[PDB]
Structure formats: structure tokens, C-alpha cells
């Protein structure tokens, strides 16, 4: 049920198309995905997982 | 990792390590260099299942790293 919960919170039960992931959201080009990775921080904080 | 492994070839070889990457961005980037450029480029839809790929990839990289 923990993993089912992760499914619930991340899938959302719908593809919104316009919303802010809790953690950004993409455009539709390949090297843009590479850049998307580039702007991600190196060390994150555990509230990204929901964890304290 | 078996000691009592004579070093005849350990003294003359090329050593490489391929345990999975540490950081969230590290694993995410690696995953974005496993199944790419024909999985990604074969779509016939930029809208829905592009988003599904991104969802599942992010899920993968999160649940793996949770164990830290």
C-alpha cells in the first residue's frame, strides 16, 4: 500500500497538461530533456519524497 | 569479491566498476542514456504517452533512491 500511495500521488489519476509537479514539468524536445536534467539540483531535500 | 584470487591478471588488466549511480540526477541521467532516441523518438504522439514515459521514469528514479 505504500507503493500504491506513491502511484496515487505521482500519477494524480490524470494527465493535467498544465500543473506544477510537487520538481518541474517538461516540454516536448529531446535536448530539452537533457537541459531539464541539467537544471536539477545536485543534492535535494527529503521532502521531495514527502519525507521529513 | 573473492580474495585468494591471484593477481597475475589483476596486475595487468583494465578495471571498471558499474554499480548504479548515486545521486537522483545521476540515476535519472543514466536512465536517460539507456533506452533513448528510438523509444523516445518513435511516438506518433507528443502529448499523452510522452507524459507517461516521463511519469514512469521519475517514479523509477524516486522509488529506487528512497532506500538511502
PDB file of N, CA and C in Angstrom, chain A residues 1-48:
ATOM      1  N   UNK A   1       0.821  -1.203   0.000  1.00  0.00           N
ATOM      2  CA  UNK A   1       0.000   0.000   0.000  1.00  0.00           C
ATOM      3  C   UNK A   1       0.856   1.255   0.000  1.00  0.00           C
ATOM      4  N   UNK A   2       2.076   1.188   0.540  1.00  0.00           N
ATOM      5  CA  UNK A   2       2.984   2.326   0.418  1.00  0.00           C
ATOM      6  C   UNK A   2       3.252   2.649  -1.048  1.00  0.00           C
ATOM      7  N   UNK A   3       3.552   1.621  -1.833  1.00  0.00           N
ATOM      8  CA  UNK A   3       3.836   1.826  -3.243  1.00  0.00           C
ATOM      9  C   UNK A   3       2.579   2.255  -3.999  1.00  0.00           C
ATOM     10  N   UNK A   4       1.413   1.722  -3.620  1.00  0.00           N
ATOM     11  CA  UNK A   4       0.166   2.199  -4.226  1.00  0.00           C
ATOM     12  C   UNK A   4      -0.021   3.683  -3.943  1.00  0.00           C
ATOM     13  N   UNK A   5       0.328   4.120  -2.733  1.00  0.00           N
ATOM     14  CA  UNK A   5       0.207   5.535  -2.403  1.00  0.00           C
ATOM     15  C   UNK A   5       1.117   6.379  -3.278  1.00  0.00           C
ATOM     16  N   UNK A   6       2.361   5.934  -3.474  1.00  0.00           N
ATOM     17  CA  UNK A   6       3.258   6.667  -4.367  1.00  0.00           C
ATOM     18  C   UNK A   6       2.653   6.777  -5.753  1.00  0.00           C
ATOM     19  N   UNK A   7       2.060   5.686  -6.235  1.00  0.00           N
ATOM     20  CA  UNK A   7       1.360   5.742  -7.505  1.00  0.00           C
ATOM     21  C   UNK A   7       0.266   6.792  -7.508  1.00  0.00           C
ATOM     22  N   UNK A   8      -0.547   6.820  -6.447  1.00  0.00           N
ATOM     23  CA  UNK A   8      -1.624   7.806  -6.348  1.00  0.00           C
ATOM     24  C   UNK A   8      -1.080   9.224  -6.442  1.00  0.00           C
ATOM     25  N   UNK A   9      -0.091   9.550  -5.616  1.00  0.00           N
ATOM     26  CA  UNK A   9       0.324  10.942  -5.533  1.00  0.00           C
ATOM     27  C   UNK A   9       1.073  11.384  -6.782  1.00  0.00           C
ATOM     28  N   UNK A  10       1.793  10.479  -7.453  1.00  0.00           N
ATOM     29  CA  UNK A  10       2.578  10.908  -8.606  1.00  0.00           C
ATOM     30  C   UNK A  10       1.777  10.866  -9.904  1.00  0.00           C
ATOM     31  N   UNK A  11       0.996   9.809 -10.145  1.00  0.00           N
ATOM     32  CA  UNK A  11       0.208   9.763 -11.376  1.00  0.00           C
ATOM     33  C   UNK A  11      -0.883  10.822 -11.379  1.00  0.00           C
ATOM     34  N   UNK A  12      -1.497  11.075 -10.221  1.00  0.00           N
ATOM     35  CA  UNK A  12      -2.587  12.014  -9.974  1.00  0.00           C
ATOM     36  C   UNK A  12      -3.940  11.480 -10.463  1.00  0.00           C
ATOM     37  N   UNK A  13      -3.991  10.326 -11.139  1.00  0.00           N
ATOM     38  CA  UNK A  13      -5.162   9.792 -11.846  1.00  0.00           C
ATOM     39  C   UNK A  13      -5.536  10.623 -13.073  1.00  0.00           C
ATOM     40  N   UNK A  14      -4.642  11.469 -13.563  1.00  0.00           N
ATOM     41  CA  UNK A  14      -4.908  12.164 -14.806  1.00  0.00           C
ATOM     42  C   UNK A  14      -3.685  12.908 -15.285  1.00  0.00           C
ATOM     43  N   UNK A  15      -3.632  13.112 -16.597  1.00  0.00           N
ATOM     44  CA  UNK A  15      -2.577  13.903 -17.227  1.00  0.00           C
ATOM     45  C   UNK A  15      -3.148  15.309 -17.354  1.00  0.00           C
ATOM     46  N   UNK A  16      -2.828  16.132 -16.355  1.00  0.00           N
ATOM     47  CA  UNK A  16      -3.324  17.505 -16.291  1.00  0.00           C
ATOM     48  C   UNK A  16      -2.992  18.294 -17.554  1.00  0.00           C
ATOM     49  N   UNK A  17      -1.743  18.228 -18.008  1.00  0.00           N
ATOM     50  CA  UNK A  17      -1.254  19.070 -19.076  1.00  0.00           C
ATOM     51  C   UNK A  17      -0.772  20.439 -18.627  1.00  0.00           C
ATOM     52  N   UNK A  18      -1.379  21.006 -17.576  1.00  0.00           N
ATOM     53  CA  UNK A  18      -1.000  22.312 -17.023  1.00  0.00           C
ATOM     54  C   UNK A  18      -1.039  22.225 -15.495  1.00  0.00           C
ATOM     55  N   UNK A  19       0.099  21.901 -14.886  1.00  0.00           N
ATOM     56  CA  UNK A  19       0.216  21.926 -13.431  1.00  0.00           C
ATOM     57  C   UNK A  19       1.685  21.818 -13.051  1.00  0.00           C
ATOM     58  N   UNK A  20       1.975  22.185 -11.805  1.00  0.00           N
ATOM     59  CA  UNK A  20       3.326  22.182 -11.264  1.00  0.00           C
ATOM     60  C   UNK A  20       3.519  20.934 -10.414  1.00  0.00           C
ATOM     61  N   UNK A  21       4.428  20.072 -10.851  1.00  0.00           N
ATOM     62  CA  UNK A  21       4.796  18.883 -10.098  1.00  0.00           C
ATOM     63  C   UNK A  21       5.361  19.299  -8.744  1.00  0.00           C
ATOM     64  N   UNK A  22       5.085  18.500  -7.708  1.00  0.00           N
ATOM     65  CA  UNK A  22       5.162  18.954  -6.304  1.00  0.00           C
ATOM     66  C   UNK A  22       6.431  19.723  -5.926  1.00  0.00           C
ATOM     67  N   UNK A  23      11.253  19.744  -8.889  1.00  0.00           N
ATOM     68  CA  UNK A  23      10.031  19.075  -9.346  1.00  0.00           C
ATOM     69  C   UNK A  23       9.255  19.907 -10.374  1.00  0.00           C
ATOM     70  N   UNK A  24       9.768  19.971 -11.599  1.00  0.00           N
ATOM     71  CA  UNK A  24       9.189  20.758 -12.680  1.00  0.00           C
ATOM     72  C   UNK A  24       8.489  19.828 -13.674  1.00  0.00           C
ATOM     73  N   UNK A  25       8.069  20.386 -14.807  1.00  0.00           N
ATOM     74  CA  UNK A  25       7.342  19.647 -15.828  1.00  0.00           C
ATOM     75  C   UNK A  25       7.799  20.066 -17.218  1.00  0.00           C
ATOM     76  N   UNK A  26       7.689  19.181 -18.207  1.00  0.00           N
ATOM     77  CA  UNK A  26       8.542  19.270 -19.391  1.00  0.00           C
ATOM     78  C   UNK A  26       7.937  20.020 -20.573  1.00  0.00           C
ATOM     79  N   UNK A  27       8.789  20.238 -21.578  1.00  0.00           N
ATOM     80  CA  UNK A  27       8.410  20.488 -22.960  1.00  0.00           C
ATOM     81  C   UNK A  27       8.726  19.225 -23.761  1.00  0.00           C
ATOM     82  N   UNK A  28       8.561  19.296 -25.080  1.00  0.00           N
ATOM     83  CA  UNK A  28       8.456  18.107 -25.923  1.00  0.00           C
ATOM     84  C   UNK A  28       9.640  17.910 -26.871  1.00  0.00           C
ATOM     85  N   UNK A  29      10.868  18.209 -26.427  1.00  0.00           N
ATOM     86  CA  UNK A  29      12.068  18.051 -27.247  1.00  0.00           C
ATOM     87  C   UNK A  29      13.164  17.349 -26.449  1.00  0.00           C
ATOM     88  N   UNK A  30      14.062  16.670 -27.174  1.00  0.00           N
ATOM     89  CA  UNK A  30      14.993  15.731 -26.548  1.00  0.00           C
ATOM     90  C   UNK A  30      16.083  16.456 -25.764  1.00  0.00           C
ATOM     91  N   UNK A  31      16.861  17.289 -26.456  1.00  0.00           N
ATOM     92  CA  UNK A  31      17.893  18.066 -25.786  1.00  0.00           C
ATOM     93  C   UNK A  31      17.295  18.955 -24.704  1.00  0.00           C
ATOM     94  N   UNK A  32      16.012  19.308 -24.827  1.00  0.00           N
ATOM     95  CA  UNK A  32      15.333  19.977 -23.724  1.00  0.00           C
ATOM     96  C   UNK A  32      15.248  19.076 -22.501  1.00  0.00           C
ATOM     97  N   UNK A  33      15.043  17.767 -22.689  1.00  0.00           N
ATOM     98  CA  UNK A  33      15.106  16.871 -21.536  1.00  0.00           C
ATOM     99  C   UNK A  33      16.507  16.851 -20.950  1.00  0.00           C
ATOM    100  N   UNK A  34      17.528  16.869 -21.810  1.00  0.00           N
ATOM    101  CA  UNK A  34      18.892  16.915 -21.285  1.00  0.00           C
ATOM    102  C   UNK A  34      19.114  18.171 -20.447  1.00  0.00           C
ATOM    103  N   UNK A  35      18.656  19.319 -20.945  1.00  0.00           N
ATOM    104  CA  UNK A  35      18.760  20.561 -20.183  1.00  0.00           C
ATOM    105  C   UNK A  35      17.942  20.488 -18.898  1.00  0.00           C
ATOM    106  N   UNK A  36      16.737  19.917 -18.979  1.00  0.00           N
ATOM    107  CA  UNK A  36      15.896  19.714 -17.807  1.00  0.00           C
ATOM    108  C   UNK A  36      16.672  18.988 -16.726  1.00  0.00           C
ATOM    109  N   UNK A  37      17.401  17.946 -17.113  1.00  0.00           N
ATOM    110  CA  UNK A  37      18.285  17.282 -16.163  1.00  0.00           C
ATOM    111  C   UNK A  37      19.362  18.247 -15.685  1.00  0.00           C
ATOM    112  N   UNK A  38      19.858  19.105 -16.581  1.00  0.00           N
ATOM    113  CA  UNK A  38      20.973  19.976 -16.221  1.00  0.00           C
ATOM    114  C   UNK A  38      20.592  20.940 -15.103  1.00  0.00           C
ATOM    115  N   UNK A  39      19.367  21.462 -15.129  1.00  0.00           N
ATOM    116  CA  UNK A  39      18.936  22.421 -14.118  1.00  0.00           C
ATOM    117  C   UNK A  39      18.500  21.764 -12.814  1.00  0.00           C
ATOM    118  N   UNK A  40      18.475  20.438 -12.741  1.00  0.00           N
ATOM    119  CA  UNK A  40      18.095  19.771 -11.490  1.00  0.00           C
ATOM    120  C   UNK A  40      19.187  20.004 -10.450  1.00  0.00           C
ATOM    121  N   UNK A  41      18.863  20.232  -9.176  1.00  0.00           N
ATOM    122  CA  UNK A  41      19.927  20.384  -8.176  1.00  0.00           C
ATOM    123  C   UNK A  41      20.693  19.090  -7.956  1.00  0.00           C
ATOM    124  N   UNK A  42      21.911  19.243  -7.436  1.00  0.00           N
ATOM    125  CA  UNK A  42      22.753  18.084  -7.154  1.00  0.00           C
ATOM    126  C   UNK A  42      22.263  17.344  -5.916  1.00  0.00           C
ATOM    127  N   UNK A  43      22.267  18.020  -4.767  1.00  0.00           N
ATOM    128  CA  UNK A  43      21.735  17.472  -3.523  1.00  0.00           C
ATOM    129  C   UNK A  43      20.353  18.064  -3.299  1.00  0.00           C
ATOM    130  N   UNK A  44      19.381  17.192  -3.060  1.00  0.00           N
ATOM    131  CA  UNK A  44      18.000  17.572  -2.815  1.00  0.00           C
ATOM    132  C   UNK A  44      17.703  17.448  -1.322  1.00  0.00           C
ATOM    133  N   UNK A  45      16.447  17.695  -0.955  1.00  0.00           N
ATOM    134  CA  UNK A  45      15.981  17.541   0.411  1.00  0.00           C
ATOM    135  C   UNK A  45      14.843  16.528   0.450  1.00  0.00           C
ATOM    136  N   UNK A  46      14.698  15.782   1.549  1.00  0.00           N
ATOM    137  CA  UNK A  46      13.841  14.592   1.515  1.00  0.00           C
ATOM    138  C   UNK A  46      12.361  14.899   1.424  1.00  0.00           C
ATOM    139  N   UNK A  47      11.950  16.152   1.603  1.00  0.00           N
ATOM    140  CA  UNK A  47      10.555  16.493   1.367  1.00  0.00           C
ATOM    141  C   UNK A  47      10.161  16.342  -0.096  1.00  0.00           C
ATOM    142  N   UNK A  48      11.125  16.192  -1.007  1.00  0.00           N
ATOM    143  CA  UNK A  48      10.787  15.799  -2.369  1.00  0.00           C
ATOM    144  C   UNK A  48      10.071  14.456  -2.362  1.00  0.00           C
TER     145      UNK A  48
END
